Design a protein around this ligand. Sequence first.
Ligand SMILES: CCCCCCCCCC(=O)O
Ligand SMILES: [K+]
Ligand SMILES: [K+]
Ligand SMILES: [K+]
Ligand SMILES: [K+]
Ligand SMILES: [K+]
Ligand code: NA
Ligand SMILES: [Zn+2]
Length: 314
Amino acid sequence: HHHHVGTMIPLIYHPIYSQLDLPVGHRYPINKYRLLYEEIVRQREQSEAWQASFEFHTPIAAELSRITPLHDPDYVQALLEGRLPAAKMRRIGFPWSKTLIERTLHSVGGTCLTVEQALQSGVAIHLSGGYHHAHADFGSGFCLFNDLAIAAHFALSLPSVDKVLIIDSDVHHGDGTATLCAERDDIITLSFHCDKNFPARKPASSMDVGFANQTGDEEFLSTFIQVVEMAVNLHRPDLILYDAGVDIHNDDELGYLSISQAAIAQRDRFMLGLAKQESIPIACVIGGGYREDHAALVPLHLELLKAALLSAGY
Ligand SMILES: CCCCCCCCCC(=O)O
Ligand SMILES: [K+]
Ligand SMILES: [K+]
Ligand SMILES: [K+]
Ligand SMILES: [K+]
Ligand SMILES: [K+]
Ligand code: NA
Ligand SMILES: [Zn+2]
């Protein structure tokens, strides 16, 4: 820790993240997690800087006591037992399986580990997470349990953390996070999103910033930068949870924004740079992204790690 000149960047990953078997043609790009992992492994083999600056951590599955402070026990139990009503499971958008549940529990564990590591090192990245469409008593939009809200509540149980700011830059409104955190004064929610993307009903975050279809780089970046700087100053958080979803990209198959890969890079560089400048721990999740070829998401997500490498210089 003090042995390192510069900052070591924990990366939290579990092989179960892409182990879920989905039908060909399923909307969800399940293999992106493994593909991103494998790219990072190649980067580490080919670069001393990548090798020296990143280290992998494996999470343990979250215990139920981590999840029921946020989620209704009856909802949780229905999912654990494989008896959630069919229409509600279809709204989540996956077939039920034991592996789905196992994966979700590990990933929730993973976002929590990312918080622990960010507190220790300043910055940590979860190679999954961002399940912002899960509410207390129901799931939706590929989200069963809301890792961001769970991790924020968990963080507040730690001595150093009295205020958490969740900054959600995935193209979709963070509706589940908004409803979960509405009554918690110590968790502030900020969402940037495309108005015409899911969900149609957008319960209020602490602050919501909506964009028109085909919004471009300059508008998006200027707004994101200035709003985030203000939110950090206003709330003085002890921890930032940052959802770096790449479904804002121009070529995303669901999102309606026109953001370039270079602007994704600048977003990430600004966000990580500001956290380091202000000495605020930042726990990142990679969030969404929709491409039929799951590998096409890899370079977009990799920009988050390229940002972290650059900020990780002494
Ligand atoms: C089986 C893994 C599913 C991961 C879900 C990631 C976030 C979905 C919602 C979004 O794109 O806004
Ligand atoms: K798979
Ligand atoms: K605390
Ligand atoms: K969002
Ligand atoms: K709140
Ligand atoms: K798009
Ligand atoms: Na709220
Ligand atoms: Zn999204």
